[PDB]
Amino acid sequence: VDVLLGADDGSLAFVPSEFSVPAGEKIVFKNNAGFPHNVLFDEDAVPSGVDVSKISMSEEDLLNAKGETFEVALSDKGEYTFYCSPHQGAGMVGKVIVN
Numbered sequence: 001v002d003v004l005l006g007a008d009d010g011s012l013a014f015v016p017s018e019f020s021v022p023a024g025e026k027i028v029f030k031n032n033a034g035f036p037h038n039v040l041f042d043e044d045a046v047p048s049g050v051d052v053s054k055i056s057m058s059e060e061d062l063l064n065a066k067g068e069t070f071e072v073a074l075s076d077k078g079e080y081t082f083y084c085s086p087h088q089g090a091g092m093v094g095k096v097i098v099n
């Protein structure tokens, strides 16, 4: 499934910001508008057993150009919160439910 980083209208949002996916589907976060963005998972809001370091960009790594992607495939079922490091204080966060 593709998830846009920034809305076409400049909103600091993941698009979509909440979605469900079967375990192991590749999620392609795709840089879209209003950079820089990145993608990290919140160590306090993922299923027990999940190591966020493996499914997160490094905080220092930013996507500054349209069409760059960060791709992950989540195998453990449950809810995961992911966020943009630059924009997480501006509500750029989202929830994927792996079922």
Ligand SMILES: [Cu+]
Residues within 6 Å of the ligand: 005, 012, 036, 037, 038, 084, 085, 086, 087, 092
């Ligand atoms: Cu962002």
